[PDB]
């Protein structure tokens, strides 16, 4: 379904935090994993959201490739736009 | 590092939604069992973590990323139907 996309939208609307999004996105991804008859565009968008969240690290000592709250927000928006799932 | 990655525990056969000393150790054992499994072999790297080595199990489809220094970074289940997954399977780039 659009569960992962909606979660992304909830996060962009700041209804849920970066930490909340990074955790729930894992729950949702697992739920849709393997689920037949899934739109490639939707599946791939979810996967990129999943990887974007994997790069999120709230700590100030995060790695050079990791991102903070802002940044996760920009990448998530960029990802939804890439797949045209605003 | 194990606590912040518990979000992926569910990919390693642990559905406990609770994150406590008990469930964490279960996750720790789940990771050890993955790495020790005869069918788990080195395959690719997690580029961003330049120098990292990933260990894949084609049965469970799980990968576990280890840093150059040998420390556990993260891990999750590969989805062969998604581009990222297919790309990893074909090129080893995670």
Swiss-Prot record, chain A:
<keyword id="KW-0079">Bacteriocin immunity</keyword>
<dbReference type="Pfam" id="PF09204">
    <property type="entry name" value="Colicin_immun"/>
</dbReference>
<dbReference type="GO" id="GO:0015643">
    <property type="term" value="F:toxic substance binding"/>
</dbReference>
<protein>
    <recommendedName>
        <fullName>Colicin-D immunity protein</fullName>
    </recommendedName>
</protein>
<dbReference type="InterPro" id="IPR036471">
    <property type="entry name" value="Colicin_D_sf"/>
</dbReference>
<dbReference type="InterPro" id="IPR015287">
    <property type="entry name" value="Colicin_D_immunity_dom"/>
</dbReference>
<dbReference type="GO" id="GO:0030153">
    <property type="term" value="P:bacteriocin immunity"/>
</dbReference>
<keyword id="KW-0614">Plasmid</keyword>
<comment type="function">
    <text>This protein is able to protect a cell, which harbors the plasmid ColD-CA23 encoding colicin D, against colicin D.</text>
</comment>
Swiss-Prot record, chain B:
<comment type="function">
    <text>Colicins are polypeptide toxins produced by and active against E.coli and closely related bacteria.</text>
</comment>
<comment type="similarity">
    <text>Belongs to the cloacin colicin family.</text>
</comment>
<protein>
    <recommendedName>
        <fullName>Colicin-D</fullName>
    </recommendedName>
</protein>
<comment type="function">
    <text>Colicin D inhibits protein synthesis.</text>
</comment>
